[PDB]
Amino acid sequence: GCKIGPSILNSDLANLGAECLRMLDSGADYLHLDVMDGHFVPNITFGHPVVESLRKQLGQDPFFDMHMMVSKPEQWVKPMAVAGANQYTFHLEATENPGALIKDIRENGMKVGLAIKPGTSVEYLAPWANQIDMALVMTVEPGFGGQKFMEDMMPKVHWLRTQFPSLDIEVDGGVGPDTVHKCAEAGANMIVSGSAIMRSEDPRSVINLLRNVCSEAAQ
Amino acid sequence: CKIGPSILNSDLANLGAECLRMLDSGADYLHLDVMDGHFVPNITFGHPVVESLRKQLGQDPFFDMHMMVSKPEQWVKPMAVAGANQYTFHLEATENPGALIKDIRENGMKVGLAIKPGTSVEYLAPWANQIDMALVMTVEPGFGGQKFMEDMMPKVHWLRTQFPSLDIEVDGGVGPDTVHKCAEAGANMIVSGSAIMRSEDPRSVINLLRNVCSEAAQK
Numbered sequence: 001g002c003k004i005g006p007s008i009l010n011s012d013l014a015n016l017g018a019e020c021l022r023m024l025d026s027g028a029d030y031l032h033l034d035v036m037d038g039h040f041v042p043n044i045t046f047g048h049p050v051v052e053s054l055r056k057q058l059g060q061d062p063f064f065d066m067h068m069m070v071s072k073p074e075q076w077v078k079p080m081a082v083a084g085a086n087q088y089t090f091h092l093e094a095t096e097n098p099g100a101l102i103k104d105i106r107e108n109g110m111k112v113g114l115a116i117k118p119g120t121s122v123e124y125l126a127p128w129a130n131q132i133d134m135a136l137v138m139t140v141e142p143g144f145g146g147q148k149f150m151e152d153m154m155p156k157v158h159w160l161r162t163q164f165p166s167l168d169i170e171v172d173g174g175v176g177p178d179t180v181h182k183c184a185e186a187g188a189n190m191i192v193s194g195s196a197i198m199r200s201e202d203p204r205s206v207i208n209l210l211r212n213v214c215s216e217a218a219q
Numbered sequence: 220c221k222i223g224p225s226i227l228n229s230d231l232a233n234l235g236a237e238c239l240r241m242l243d244s245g246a247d248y249l250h251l252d253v254m255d256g257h258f259v260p261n262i263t264f265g266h267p268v269v270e271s272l273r274k275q276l277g278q279d280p281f282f283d284m285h286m287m288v289s290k291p292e293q294w295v296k297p298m299a300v301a302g303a304n305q306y307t308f309h310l311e312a313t314e315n316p317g318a319l320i321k322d323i324r325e326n327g328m329k330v331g332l333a334i335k336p337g338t339s340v341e342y343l344a345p346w347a348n349q350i351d352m353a354l355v356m357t358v359e360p361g362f363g364g365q366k367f368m369e370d371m372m373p374k375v376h377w378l379r380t381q382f383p384s385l386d387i388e389v390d391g392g393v394g395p396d397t398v399h400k401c402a403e404a405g406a407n408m409i410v411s412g413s414a415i416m417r418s419e420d421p422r423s424v425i426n427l428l429r430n431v432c433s434e435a436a437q438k
């Protein structure tokens with residue numbers, strides 16, 4: 001039940017279709033697409049127009065997990081749905097009413113993700129955990145790739161896994177062949193990996209390794 | 220007169236290939252639309268895409284950054300480091316045009332100043348002598364393929380008359396159908412999207428825009 005979703009944040013963004021195609025051909029279970037509006041986090045990546053072009057290049061089959069690091073997630077639900085996103089993962093810190101937003105995401109036919117930054121207590125995620133498809137536990141401060149994995153986040157993963165046995169739990173930030181062990185032992189089953197996969201000459205084997213470490217923990 | 224294609228409606232999953240075709244077709248520069256989802260209701264891309272584009276396209280091509288962002292002060296260094304040549308910010312968006320103009324120059328970039336259709340051209344007067352280029356929007360910013368606003372031409376004419384040394388750019392629904400109106404009013408930098416982007420022979424369209432604009436200039 002473990003899935004690997006490469007992040008393309010530090011890929012060749014001038015050739016994004018190509019980068020995504022090769023992640024998929026390398027065995028990626030899904031694509032984790034980082035959307036940053038320069039307000040919720042101090043960086044700007046891309047938005048629904050890029051998603052639309054990607055969906056056109058990759059076809060209908062690939063699963064897009066949209067990491068919405070934006071300050072008004074309500075605004076981009078419909079645009080992302082129309083663009084062909086499968087899952088809309090918004091930040092708990094980015095809205096006054098997660099309940100209403102969750103409803104709107106489903107109304108627009110997408111799966112629901114809910115993310116929390118390192119400084120945000122997992123306790124605040126809990127009231128909504130039964131209403132979402134996937135919780136995202138950030139393992140770096142969002143906005144930049146290539147940062148150091150924060151192992152102190154693991155109790156958040158373990159606690160969610162304990163309280164919500166069926167919940168899909170994603171980790172994101174500095175996850176690689178080493179740190180994936182900590183994530184998997186803590187209970188995570190969805191692994192986002194950027195620089196570790198993207199700056200490897202053999203992404204197939206990195207992905208295979210991440211998934212195996214994960215599966216053995218799930219066992 | 221210089222022609223700078225806009226890539227707003229291109230295949231955004233292949234920005235490199237799109238821009239390369241534009242340069243190989245003799246584009247004078249590239250006009251790169253940066254939208255943060257706040258100043259305008261759309262998100263395109265930011266400096267990370269610019270960095271990858273600069274790496275793909277080489278040191279020589281000129282990038283005109285149309286910064287439709289609410290905090291233009293924030294992205295000056297990041298765009299400079301990314302390799303942008305000109306930083307064109309919106310007068311409506313800045314807290315302090317004078318300070319920002321200075322910062323742009325401290326960062327080695329040329330200075331552009333843009334105004335939306337509803338913004339009176341006289342707002343530019345205090346700054347025209349400090350900037351390299353004025354951008355007169357000929358559509359409401361946020362999206363490509365909108366209809367050219369001929370009622371903006373008196374702004375262009377007024378600028379050209381009052382500030383003979385000022386480079387003046389028009390942007391929004393400019394193509395072979397409307398370029399003459401822009402040139403006769405005094406624009407010498409022409410941004411065009413759809414009309415160039417779809418062509419089999421972008422070189423011919425670019426040459427046409429440039430020639431129409433140049434001959435109108437010679438009166």
Ligand SMILES: O=C(CO)[C@H](O)[C@H](O)COP(=O)(O)O
Nearest residue numbers: 142143145146173174194195
């Ligand atoms: O959301 C993110 C950061 O905001 C990215 O998904 C994360 O950085 C993945 O990159 P890496 O594996 O290189 O840390």
Ligand SMILES: O=C(CO)[C@H](O)[C@H](O)COP(=O)(O)O
Nearest residue numbers: 360361362363364391392412
């Ligand atoms: O800034 C812009 C819109 O916000 C674009 O540069 C403009 O739309 C150019 O595209 P087109 O030539 O298709 O109008």
Ligand SMILES: [Fe+2]
Nearest residue numbers: 007034067172
């Ligand atoms: Fe992410």
Ligand SMILES: [Fe+2]
Nearest residue numbers: 225252285390
């Ligand atoms: Fe523009």
